[PDB]
Amino acid sequence: IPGANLLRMAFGVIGTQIVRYRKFEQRVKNDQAQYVSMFGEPFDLAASVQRVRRDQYAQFNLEFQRNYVMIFANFDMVDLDRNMAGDQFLWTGRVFQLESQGSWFYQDGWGVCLAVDIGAAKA
Amino acid sequence: MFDGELIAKLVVELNAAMTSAQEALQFPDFEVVQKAQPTQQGTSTRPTIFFQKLFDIPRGWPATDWHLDNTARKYVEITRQHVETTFQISSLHWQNPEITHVVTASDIANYVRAYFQARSTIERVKELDFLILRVSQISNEAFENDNHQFEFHPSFDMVVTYNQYIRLYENAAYSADGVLIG
């Protein structure tokens, strides 16, 4: 049934991880016609993190392996619109590109590994 | 004169041009952004103008000047190169068929191009230490768009000429001696 949350009851068996999630609010300019975005109030979310397992390529002598992650969560999260995206970090900042069945009961995620986290208790 | 101040002056001028064009043609609202977003972004559903740099031409042999520092007994060699750079200007606007008042993205592109070619604009720009050459073509291109609705993406190229300076050091001589033989 597309009623009660299936991922809700599934999380009672498999076991999950904990990530810090922050949502996008609005953006401004930096007198260079470049958008700079700002988020608000990161919080703790319970989610299941999977693998798709990158293989690299080349442009010329440059390898550039792009890091990917698949995340299942019961959150109505948005990856892209005329606004910005969302952020997370299991150990380093990430950004995702997809949607899922949000308006019923749960969604599915993605992620590309940004460089690092700031530190000081992993801000 | 390097890139950052070039971009700052260019965005200021584009903002002024769009403020003029809004009065001229009555758009709802406008926005000026770059096509070099370092961060993931999502575009805007407003009459927008875009710019980007393509390449660069040195245009001439370097010219060197010598300035002497008396205290340290050194020549400071200044080298100047007259650089020409190319910018691509493009715009977006979606046509609502129901509204009777019609304005095209091609109209915005044409007005922005015409603004930069006026004598008054060039006179204002000259005191900002660069100049503009002639623009020769504007083209309309049609694409499918994310809503599966056709629309146009007009664009044209502009040329900006300026000067670049670097400085280096060189030894200095203060006397001459010679020998004569026969």
Side-chain angles (χ1 to χ4, degrees):
Chain A
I1 182 170
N5 196 326
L6 260 63
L7 200 62
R8 184 181 66 189
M9 51 205 58
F11 277 174
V13 165
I14 50 176
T16 75
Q17 291 88 70
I18 293 299
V19 301
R20 300 213 66 171
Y21 194 95
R22 65 179 64 88
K23 267 202 75 76
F24 166 69
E25 313 197 328
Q26 43 74 20
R27 43 163 150 92
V28 292
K29 306 269 189 58
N30 68 336
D31 64 358
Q32 278 271 340
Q34 307 203 292
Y35 277 130
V36 60
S37 57
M38 64 184 73
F39 309 95
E41 291 325 329
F43 58 91
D44 285 87
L45 183 63
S48 159
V49 173
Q50 313 266 300
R51 54 141 290 290
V52 298
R53 287 316 171 278
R54 61 184 66 87
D55 298 326
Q56 77 271 19
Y57 54 86
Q59 175 272 356
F60 182 76
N61 188 41
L62 315 189
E63 298 315 278
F64 295 159
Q65 199 194 27
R66 43 189 49 168
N67 299 63
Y68 288 163
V69 170
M70 177 90 50
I71 172 175
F72 287 75
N74 47 355
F75 195 84
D76 300 333
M77 59 211 196
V78 56
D79 72 329
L80 177 64
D81 209 338
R82 304 321 181 111
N83 49 16
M84 280 282 295
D87 274 340
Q88 76 168 256
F89 54 111
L90 195 59
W91 314 82
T92 43
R94 325 182 101 80
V95 65
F96 39 83
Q97 313 94 313
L98 74 165
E99 296 293 328
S100 283
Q101 314 196 0
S103 293
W104 300 262
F105 62 95
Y106 88 92
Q107 288 182 355
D108 185 74
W110 258 97
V112 191
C113 191
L114 263 54
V116 298
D117 62 358
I118 296 293
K122 324 322 161 283
Chain B
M1 184 177 177
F2 284 110
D3 267 18
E5 66 275 17
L6 294 174
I7 307 291
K9 305 199 194 273
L10 194 66
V11 301
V12 165
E13 293 306 324
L14 287 172
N15 275 106
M18 276 279 174
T19 56
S20 163
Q22 195 178 9
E23 267 196 63
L25 296 200
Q26 316 286 32
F27 325 122
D29 271 312
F30 66 92
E31 201 180 356
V32 59
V33 304
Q34 182 164 15
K35 277 192 168 202
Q37 302 302 303
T39 306
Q40 168 179 334
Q41 307 277 348
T43 68
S44 64
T45 47
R46 294 141 71 101
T48 312
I49 193 66
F50 297 86
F51 67 95
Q52 176 189 179
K53 185 205 320 203
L54 282 72
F55 51 74
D56 188 352
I57 315 291
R59 189 43 42 82
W61 281 36
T64 179
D65 314 324
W66 273 278
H67 163 263
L68 161 75
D69 186 74
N70 264 320
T71 81
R73 309 194 87 77
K74 301 290 294 321
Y75 280 161
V76 175
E77 160 179 356
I78 296 97
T79 311
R80 188 201 94 248
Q81 175 86 45
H82 181 78
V83 168
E84 290 182 353
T85 186
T86 313
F87 280 79
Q88 177 143 55
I89 315 291
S90 66
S91 82
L92 279 175
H93 196 27
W94 183 74
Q95 307 291 7
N96 190 226
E98 299 106 350
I99 63 170
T100 180
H101 162 267
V102 56
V103 60
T104 307
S106 164
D107 292 358
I108 319 185
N110 288 340
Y111 196 99
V112 170
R113 177 229 65 201
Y115 182 85
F116 271 113
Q117 300 296 286
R119 260 93 183 190
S120 180
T121 309
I122 292 170
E123 281 216 40
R124 274 192 327 113
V125 170
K126 154 181 157 47
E127 59 90 18
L128 302 174
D129 291 331
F130 65 99
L131 285 174
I132 302 166
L133 300 169
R134 176 174 162 80
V135 166
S136 47
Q137 187 175 2
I138 306 183
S139 45
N140 291 291
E141 181 206 340
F143 63 109
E144 191 66 330
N145 174 57
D146 49 9
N147 299 335
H148 277 281
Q149 323 179 116
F150 290 98
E151 61 183 289
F152 294 117
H153 187 54
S155 89
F156 72 94
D157 295 335
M158 216 183 58
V159 185
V160 168
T161 76
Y162 63 91
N163 282 298
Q164 273 175 0
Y165 286 100
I166 68 168
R167 292 180 179 90
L168 279 174
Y169 283 106
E170 181 56 299
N171 268 9
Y174 272 90
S175 79
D177 307 304
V179 294
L180 305 157
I181 62 170

